């Protein structure tokens, strides 16, 4: 007989761009070394100066 | 520096912001400011 607070969280995927998202945190920038950096969707291999 | 017609210079017209509306769109219309009627001569415009 104990009660339950059923929570139904519906996440839409209609013809509207994403509005709610979680981050990918966190890392520190490293300079003067070969790092496979990722900058907000820009992915590349190189030395940062 | 001109009066009525468009200027003659070249301007790079920078962005302001993007909006995620995602709706169809066909027609626009502008809004104008009309100081409402007073005792200065219906009187609009």
From Swiss-Prot, chain A:
Reported effect, residue 15 to P: Increased resistance to human covalescent sera neutralization
Reported impact of residue 1 to H: In strain: Omicron/BA.1, Omicron/BA.2, Omicron/BA.2.12.1, Omicron/BA.2.75, Omicron/BA.4, Omicron/BA.5, Omicron/BQ.1.1, Omicron/XBB.1.5, Omicron/EG.5.1
Region feature Disordered, mapped onto this chain: 15-37
Role noted for this protein: Attaches the virion to the cell membrane by interacting with host receptor, initiating the infection. The major receptor is host ACE2. When S2/S2' has been cleaved, binding to the receptor triggers direct fusion at the cell membrane. When S2/S2' has not been cleaved, binding to the receptor results in internalization of the virus by endocytosis using host TFRC and GRM2 and leading to fusion of the virion membrane with the host endosomal membrane. Alternatively, may use NRP1/NRP2 and integrin as entry receptors.
Assembly mode: Binds to host ACE2. RBD also interacts with the N-linked glycan on 'Asn-90' of ACE2. Cleavage of S generates a polybasic C-terminal sequence on S1 that binds to host Neuropilin-1 (NRP1) and Neuropilin-2 (NRP2) receptors. Interacts with host integrin alpha-5/beta-1 (ITGA5:ITGB1) and with ACE2 in complex with integrin alpha-5/beta-1 (ITGA5:ITGB1). May interact via cytoplasmic c-terminus with M protein. May interact (via N-terminus) with host bilirubin and biliverdin, thereby preventing antibody binding to the SARS-CoV-2 spike NTD via an allosteric mechanism.
Protein name: Spike protein S1
Source species of the chain: Severe acute respiratory syndrome coronavirus 2 (2019-nCoV)
Lineage per the UniProt record: Viruses, Riboviria, Orthornavirae, Pisuviricota, Pisoniviricetes
Gene that this polypeptide is encoded by: S
Covered residues, full protein: 505 to 553 of 1273
């Amino acid at each position: 007989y104990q009660p339950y607070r059923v929570v139904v969280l519906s996440f839409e995927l209609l013809h509207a761009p994403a509005t709610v998202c979680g981050p990918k945190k966190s890392t520190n920038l490293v300079k003067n070394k070969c790092v496979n950096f990722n900058f907000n969707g820009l992915t590349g291999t190189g030395v940062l100066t | 520096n001109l009066v009525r017609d468009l200027p003659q210079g070249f301007s790079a017209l920078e962005p302001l912001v993007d909006l995620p509306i995602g709706i169809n769109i066909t027609r626009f219309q502008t809004l104008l400011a009309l100081h409402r009627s007073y005792l200065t001569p219906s009187g609009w415009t």
